[PDB]
Write a protein that binds this ligand. Structure first.
Ligand SMILES: CC(C)CCC[C@@H](C)[C@H]1CC[C@H]2[C@@H]3CC=C4C[C@@H](O)CC[C@]4(C)[C@H]3CC[C@]12C
Ligand SMILES: CCCCCCCC/C=C\CCCCCCCC(=O)OC[C@H](O)CO
Ligand SMILES: CCCCCCCC/C=C\CCCCCCCC(=O)OC[C@H](O)CO
Ligand SMILES: CCCCCCCC/C=C\CCCCCCCC(=O)OC[C@H](O)CO
Ligand SMILES: CCCCCCCC/C=C\CCCCCCCC(=O)OC[C@H](O)CO
Ligand SMILES: C1=C(c2c[nH]c3ncccc23)CCN(CCCc2ccccc2)C1
Ligand SMILES: C1=C(c2c[nH]c3ncccc23)CCN(CCCc2ccccc2)C1
Lengths: 167, 164
């Protein structure tokens, strides 16, 4: 019938947050959670992503990146079902301030991630021991997996600051 | 007035942040020749006294945060100082929430590294940084207020009745 732009974005936000739950549990937190909570097929799927996409941070996370991973588990993950509910339902003014908090937190998390992937040395002679992108194409093929987690928080932040239906 | 007392404190927090950012925090991002020799020696006194391994030669993740301090945070500092020094500025709430969560998120990995990383002959930091746990507390002593004060500002904006 009639699907408006506001309501389409809210459905999009619901699927972003519903999809983030398995992504966080089964892939992102492989570097902090014990391996034995994962079946071998899921651990080898984890290995496939790291080999194909040349990811230097997820499997063996540095301290700065490991601190963001514990924020994902302890702060972001409980919020994902609540935000999925609110944006699927659509009329929830009580999601404004928590969504802005999430959006700023996640955009700030991803600035150093994207800068490290674009600018740092991931060679054998580095501490990443060659498990990172070497070519400019390998850097941008990996950034492509992280960039929606900056941009979609950026869209959510703009939506929540200006939408009269949430203030 | 306890509400006004916090606003005066927050006002002096944002005012003092301006020189702290320009003359000290951005030594690794901005060029050496911009700074006079007396300011460069003062920066060296901080680095050596507090054994700071990040500020002078910033890693890429910390450097990205420093650029956020120059481009986003520093333009906000005078506007926030005015708002809280004057009071009655409900329009600062959503900006101050954004500033606070951004700076809290910035400080979590910094504080984590300073407290949980081995700086003892780690080729990562060229033999610099805190070695004992007391040296770690001494360094964190200058970073912790820039997490706790933003945390106070967040609760202030989210819960205080004037700022919704
Ligand atoms: C005299 C020595 C010690 C310090 C020199 C300070 C210089 C480098 C400072 C003073 C004011 C600063 C500017 C203040 C505000 C902004 C807006 C921001 O969006 C980009 C950076 C920019 C444009 C800053 C660039 C650096 C700057 C020009
Ligand atoms: C308060 C903040 C902390 C709590 C936040 C919520 C924590 C979520 C809990 C568990 C998820 C664990 C994920 C591991 C899933 C592994 C898959 C698995 O076990 O598969 C089953 C089996 O192999 C089939 O036969
Ligand atoms: C009020 C709005 C009602 C219509 C939209 C809600 C439907 C959600 C199901 C989709 C996600 C289910 C996943 C489990
Ligand atoms: C080798 C460099 C020596 C001095 C460089 C001058 C240019 C930087 C001046 C202002 C930047 C403000 C942001
Ligand atoms: C409603 C206002 C929207 C714009 C707010 C920012 C405007 C100017 C930057 C001022 C700081 C410059 C510091 C040098
Ligand atoms: C880190 C992410 C992340 C989001 N928010 C965070 N906050 C703090 C810390 C990290 C994050 C999200 C993206 N994720 C990559 C998933 C790669 C993948 C997806 C699907 C199937 C297989 C493999 C790495
Ligand atoms: C980094 C800081 C910081 C605050 N916000 C940020 N956002 C993003 C990135 C960094 C920061 C503030 C503290 N500062 C140390 C000043 C030590 C000092 C102060 C005064 C005189 C001499 C020496 C290091």
């Amino acid at each position: 019938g009639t699907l408006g732009a506001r309501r389409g974005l809210e459905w999009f936000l619901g699927f972003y947050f519903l999809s983030h739950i398995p992504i966080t549990l089964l892939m992102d937190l492989q570097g902090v959670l014990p391996r034995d909570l994962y079946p071998v097929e899921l651990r080898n799927l984890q290995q496939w992503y790291i080999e194909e996409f040349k990811d230097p941070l997820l499997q063996t996370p540095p301290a700065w990146f490991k601190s963001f991973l514990f924020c994902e588990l302890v702060f972001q993950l409980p919020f994902f079902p609540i935000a999925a509910y609110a944006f699927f339902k659509g009329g929830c003014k009580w999601i404004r301030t928590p969504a802005i908090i999430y959006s700023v937190h996640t955009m700030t998390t991803l600035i150093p991630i994207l800068s490290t992937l674009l600018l740092d040395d991931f060679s054998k002679a580095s501490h990443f021991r060659g498990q990172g992108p070497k070519t400019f194409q390998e850097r941008l093929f990996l950034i492509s997996v992280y960039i929606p987690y900056f941009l979609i928080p950026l869209i959510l932040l703009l939506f929540m600051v200006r939408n009269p239906y949430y203030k």
